[PDB]
């Protein structure tokens, strides 16, 4: 509360180690059906269903032009990738599973750097 303050975690590594993070995700090779933003006019549905698209290089843009605020903002456009993968394609295709895959690699990069 005012002038009451838990002490000051460091959060000066944070831009550099989400970068290394998202170069790791867009290295992947079940990564391509994230690196781009689906396009809305050739894909029925889309648009409609998918409120909030999501993808890899919008995240990169946002990241490198001061758009987070902090890492969990971060973390939960990278979530959002794969919840909209989950919402739109069905668990066994081919894009289904490359969405868990990720969100799996994810996870654990996401808790072994940060937690």
């Not at 990169?60 to 794969?82: H, I, M």
């Amino acid at each position: 509360s005012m002038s009451v303050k838990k002490p000051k975690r460091d959060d000066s590594k944070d831009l550099a180690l989400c970068s290394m993070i998202l170069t790791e995700m867009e290295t992947h090779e079940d990564a391509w059906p994230f690196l781009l933003p689906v396009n809305l006019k050739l894909v029925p549905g889309y648009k409609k269903v998918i409120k909030k698209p999501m993808d890899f290089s919008t995240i990169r843009e946002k990241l490198s032009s001061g758009q987070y605020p902090n890492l969990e903002t971060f973390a939960l456009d990278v979530r959002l990738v794969f919840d909209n993968c989950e919402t739109f394609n069905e668990d066994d295709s081919d894009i289904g599973r490359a969405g868990h895959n990720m969100r799996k690699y994810f996870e654990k990069k996401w808790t072994d750097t940060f937690k």
